[PDB]
Amino acid sequence: VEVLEVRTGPDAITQIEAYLNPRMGNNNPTDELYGYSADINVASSKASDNPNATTLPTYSVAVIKLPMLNEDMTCDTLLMWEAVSVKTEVMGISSLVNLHQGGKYIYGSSSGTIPVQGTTLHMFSVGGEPLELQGLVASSTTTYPTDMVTIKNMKPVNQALDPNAKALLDKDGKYPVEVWSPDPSKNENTRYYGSFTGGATTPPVMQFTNSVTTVLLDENGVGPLCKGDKLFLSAVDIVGIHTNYSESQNWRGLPRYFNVTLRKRVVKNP
Amino acid sequence: VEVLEVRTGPDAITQIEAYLNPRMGNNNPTDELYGYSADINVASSKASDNPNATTLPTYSVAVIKLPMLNEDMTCDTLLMWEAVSVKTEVMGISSLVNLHQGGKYIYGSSSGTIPVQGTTLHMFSVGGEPLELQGLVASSTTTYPTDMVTIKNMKPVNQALDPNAKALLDKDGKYPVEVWSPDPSKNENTRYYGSFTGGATTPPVMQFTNSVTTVLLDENGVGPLCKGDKLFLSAVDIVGIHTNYSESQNWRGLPRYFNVTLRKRVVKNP
Amino acid sequence: VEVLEVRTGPDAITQIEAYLNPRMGNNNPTDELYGYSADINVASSKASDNPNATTLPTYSVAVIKLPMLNDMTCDTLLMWEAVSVKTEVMGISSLVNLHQGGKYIYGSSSGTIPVQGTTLHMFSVGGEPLELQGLVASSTTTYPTDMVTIKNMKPVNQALDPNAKALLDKDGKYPVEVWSPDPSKNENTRYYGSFTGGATTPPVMQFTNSVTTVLLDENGVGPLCKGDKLFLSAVDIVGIHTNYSESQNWRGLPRYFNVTLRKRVVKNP
Amino acid sequence: VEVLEVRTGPDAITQIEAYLNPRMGNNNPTDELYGYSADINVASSKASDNPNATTLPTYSVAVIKLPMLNDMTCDTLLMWEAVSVKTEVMGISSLVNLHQGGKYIYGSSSGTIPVQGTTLHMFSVGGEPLELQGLVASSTTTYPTDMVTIKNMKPVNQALDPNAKALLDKDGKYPVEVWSPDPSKNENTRYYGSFTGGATTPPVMQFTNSVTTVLLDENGVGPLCKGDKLFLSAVDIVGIHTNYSESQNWRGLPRYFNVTLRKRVVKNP
Amino acid sequence: VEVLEVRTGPDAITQIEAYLNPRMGNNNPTDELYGYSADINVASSKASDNPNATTLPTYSVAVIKLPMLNEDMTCDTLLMWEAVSVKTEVMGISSLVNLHQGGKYIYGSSSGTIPVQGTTLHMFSVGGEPLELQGLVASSTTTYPTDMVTIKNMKPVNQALDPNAKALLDKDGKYPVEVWSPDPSKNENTRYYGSFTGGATTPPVMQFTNSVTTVLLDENGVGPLCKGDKLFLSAVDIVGIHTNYSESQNWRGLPRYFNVTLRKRVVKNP
């Protein structure tokens, strides 16, 4: 679609806000361990790697419906909502500042417990359509739960780049992060931003503020354009691993807030 | 409230300073371990987790009364104090540079003792009303002391985002950091800045200088506006954990200094 | 070659995109451990050090053929000039995995240690092969003969031997522990590398589609593609995987490139 | 004083330079362990904590007498204004030493553990003594009477007691664990500090002669030297050296200052 | 000498390149462990600390002879070469990415070996005369090899700043880093840049690129001026410690490349 100028005048700007709850494996709000995975079940061998669905963190996604812009669809030009900037925040960070939760002792049984630590993964995206994904796994011989969306008919090539392994992030809590990542060869109409630090016991590091805005405009001054007046918000915020007294382990996630400013953009009627 | 222009002229600027003492759990200045929590008392299980009030760090808050500005409340326009910038500093940082305090030896009994280390959490906020808070916990089955302000009738939803778990930071030493964090969906009239590094034994890192100012104006050039001529200052500065000889542990906190510059802002009378 | 002005007008600009699969040692897509090295075989001594080819990560290289620009007698020619690149290490979140068969973090009730330790990231974009300098940990290492390594090593190759030079002209052949970008050459290539060592170091990576690197030099000139060929080179070693028996495999990830090129006028030589 | 404009013309600018040696506890240059604290002596309990004077790092301070500027009648006077400073921790590379007596890294065939753990770096440049705020880890600690510490301590002193104030007016007398710069004062000093804690943390330091710190405030005014005196203050604890017996000493390094000053006109008070 | 303006015109700019090989202790290219120190030999006691020359890393220095500028030395003004900017690079960084070198196992005898790690020291300097040095040691009772250049007649004062402990970096592989550092009270005619990270097992961190230039001009816009048409390049690049199977240890250094751009500067004839 040919993109023209920004539409000026009163009522040309709008703003939405939303939060996405984490989807660490216990994904129902009545689950005792909502916001965590179940105890990790580890592969027995290369050939026998059957991770339980509840142990696998997935991506969060929400579709926000925006006000309808075009009365009749037959004028030479149309309007689309253009995402211009976002304020985003990982919520409840200070919940990890807690040394009394049941778990593994830091020293002996007189000490506090080890807080959430280890691998972290933070991703947010804002687009005018679903986030486009690339499949890649640690091991093609893992058998994934069938009620999740994973790579069909995996082979060892899927341990690196197979250009046939593509998907859309179109379902909340279904696409495992260990299988899918943002596809940089597409996503022309989405801006995504991601951060990873690995390790078993790494100290998690996070900032929180209401003073920072990310501008979503591309090199040409154009932000994501919302097809069918729909805005797509995606996230994952794995903040580390909680270790229990018995040494079993649960992934821990946190929710993410989005505040997106949008404006009206003229496009040519296709 | 329709915000208008900055009032210029002599005496249009004022400046306040304040310090907030840490509320680590021992919050009475006659407490032997004032500036620390009591020995952390750890849950025996998921179901049984009763942290003592003295073991839970809370937010500091102070209200600064500013000179009154409006004689007539008849006038078509009124003046409010607008917070423009802040210098803020964590005080007594070098008190941590101490290897003789009674505790746990670094190596054997000929060595110095382990200094304060582990999880850190730093936050300051400057606003024209109480900081708005969102509740989220590590465990919804925790029983919090009834004399603290925490989430009423928790369910497992409270381990992630429950949109009903909201509060105002309107009491000093009452809101546990492990339960509450700044709400990014509100706080239009407060600037907050936060930094977290987790981990069991992580070395703390801190800077101190009198050369750095934070500017508090939003993207329209408007800082926090002080309702009823009150300026709200909030903080928490957990600098880590002290470990005792028996391996019991206390949170350690430090005081925070604020120097705030304010100016007169014209607003439309409501 | 004398470099003249940029050629303006419609069709003055083109873009390409490619990805390079990692070459960690298992370099065939049907290899069970594709994207990993084989179990590291360690030297029993300084004198006795014969690493298997499957255990030695090598540089990835791709040559992209660009639209033919030039008749070859005009007094000025056109060359494709690489102006900027968006590049991305793909599959980063694949490391966010605690269930893979391996070594337990704590006892046997816990998750397994994820990929961690030494990392090496390099990308380059050039108008000819990346020029290489040879330097090794040990000059007494015997390398696999079917790889390209330093000929007739002496202890001088543990430091700078001005004679140990090569071109990155084959994919999966030049070991990273032998070869590195030659800063005394490479006038026509831009390279960018970072290294963090250690055995257990947590890996750190970012991913976004918002970042572009400008390739122009201090005279405003990017790499100029000789014979309309664009050279893309990479290595992305994201750490070490540890197996249950404590054997270890290097782990690598693929890299994406999106390069923008413009027509540059040059004086005919 | 009412501060007026900068005085221009020939000879309006000056430079001084100085070094301050560290005061870690062994503060006499003939001390066998000069530049180190004596072996750390640890408290037996909350009630009993009697650190020896020689175990407690203190701030360094020097007063530089500047050229006499003024007669005192004139409606306006000149003061030296500290404009900028180049400052350097000297002898950083002295830490790059694994043969020194100490605790083995692995077994007795290995090198010894180098200086590591808690570090504290501070420098200040002002026109009067640095103003200090008292705060300690323990109010029941008994400090050496020959040092300057907080009078009549109570548990409030484990946090902010607004009465606990002092001036850094003596070299090697004010313990860093008792005093820090007071941000509620120090209008006429600029101070800069960084702290990293932990018991075994690797120290990190840079050294260059290319970096200057500008000392002007948001009104373009630097510290003004009362009575033509310039105050330089510092502490540079670079970590802890551990002996074979596992007893431990703080290690400090000297700091160099090069300050540029100019003449500032002020109203006679 | 009085420094005047930059000389303009054709042929006013020259460019040199050079490499400096590391001087870790095994400093002869035929040495089996060239580019490493010999096994560290640890002090028996404070009184008995005799490090072997081969165990002590020294600075690298090279003198580059530049084209002769002044035809008649009686003219009232003269030209000097002025170092304007440098591109510099540590070479062979990726040689460290090697887990099969003989050494100490990361885990048991089935694993890779521990790569080079621990204390790093990086310095480069570009000057128009020898880099000026200040003496400072960890221990004044250390007995250094007489074949090296160290502090004469050490006393305890040399554990801190002795103003009489000065030297010039005027010989390659002779001035140990543990005794000498750049003197900030001098070096008006040299620019030096240094970086240190200690510890015994710290991961080394290095970058490499050909896209970065350091500008050498001072605040008056004057770079180092090459006395007698000599350009002084100095370096040390200790990238860590290699541990052998028997647990003995060797410093590891890497060579450094320089590409310095120079221009002609007018000076008044003294």
Ligand SMILES: CC(=O)N[C@H]1[C@H]([C@H](O)[C@H](O)CO)O[C@@](O[C@H]2[C@@H](O)[C@@H](CO)O[C@@H](O[C@H]3[C@H](O)[C@@H](O)[C@H](O)O[C@@H]3CO)[C@@H]2O)(C(=O)O)C[C@@H]1O
């Ligand atoms: C992430 C998180 O919140 N982890 C909890 C865990 C988990 O709920 C559990 O591991 C499932 O993943 O529970 C922790 O406490 C449990 C632990 O102390 C075990 C003993 O190791 O006992 C459990 O209670 C038992 C009780 O002991 C028995 O008398 C009874 O038969 O059953 C109870 C419930 O099964 C504790 O809940 C843990 O450390 O694993 C606390 C963590 O914070």
Ligand SMILES: CC(=O)N[C@H]1[C@H]([C@H](O)[C@H](O)CO)O[C@@](O[C@H]2[C@@H](O)[C@@H](CO)O[C@@H](O[C@H]3[C@H](O)[C@@H](O)[C@H](O)O[C@@H]3CO)[C@@H]2O)(C(=O)O)C[C@@H]1O
């Ligand atoms: C990078 C990676 O994927 N590593 C795998 C490894 C490698 O595939 C393997 O080390 C070759 O380099 O395999 C891991 O699982 C193996 C391990 O559990 C060993 C026990 O030490 O047994 C292997 O299965 C055997 C099995 O024991 C026999 O019954 C069978 O007949 O032969 C099988 C094949 O050898 C496991 O596959 C590993 O931890 O080493 C899992 C890693 O994820």
Ligand SMILES: CC(=O)N[C@H]1[C@H]([C@H](O)[C@H](O)CO)O[C@@](O[C@H]2[C@@H](O)[C@@H](CO)O[C@@H](O[C@H]3[C@H](O)[C@@H](O)[C@H](O)O[C@@H]3CO)[C@@H]2O)(C(=O)O)C[C@@H]1O
């Ligand atoms: C933050 C802080 O200052 N921690 C102290 C602690 C705390 O005061 C205490 O743990 C309460 O939270 O005390 C430390 O010293 C005590 C320790 O040596 C214990 C031995 O386990 O003894 C205590 O003194 C006892 C004494 O031993 C008895 O004879 C007497 O009957 O009672 C005394 C007081 O209970 C020490 O105070 C500690 O290591 O726990 C020192 C820390 O710095």
Ligand SMILES: CC(=O)N[C@H]1[C@H]([C@H](O)[C@H](O)CO)O[C@@](O[C@H]2[C@@H](O)[C@@H](CO)O[C@@H](O[C@H]3[C@H](O)[C@@H](O)[C@H](O)O[C@@H]3CO)[C@@H]2O)(C(=O)O)C[C@@H]1O
């Ligand atoms: C920096 C470096 O490359 N270190 C080497 C070292 C050094 O060359 C050496 O330690 C002197 O600094 O050698 C390493 O391999 C040796 C090691 O396995 C030892 C056993 O601890 O044996 C040496 O070979 C011996 C062999 O074992 C004997 O049977 C024979 O009689 O003598 C041989 C030579 O002494 C190995 O060379 C090491 O681990 O120390 C490998 C390091 O990479």
Ligand SMILES: [Ca+2]
């Ligand atoms: Ca594409």
Ligand SMILES: [Ca+2]
């Ligand atoms: Ca809102």
Ligand SMILES: [Ca+2]
């Ligand atoms: Ca060259």
Ligand SMILES: [Ca+2]
């Ligand atoms: Ca004040």
Ligand SMILES: [Ca+2]
């Ligand atoms: Ca001097």
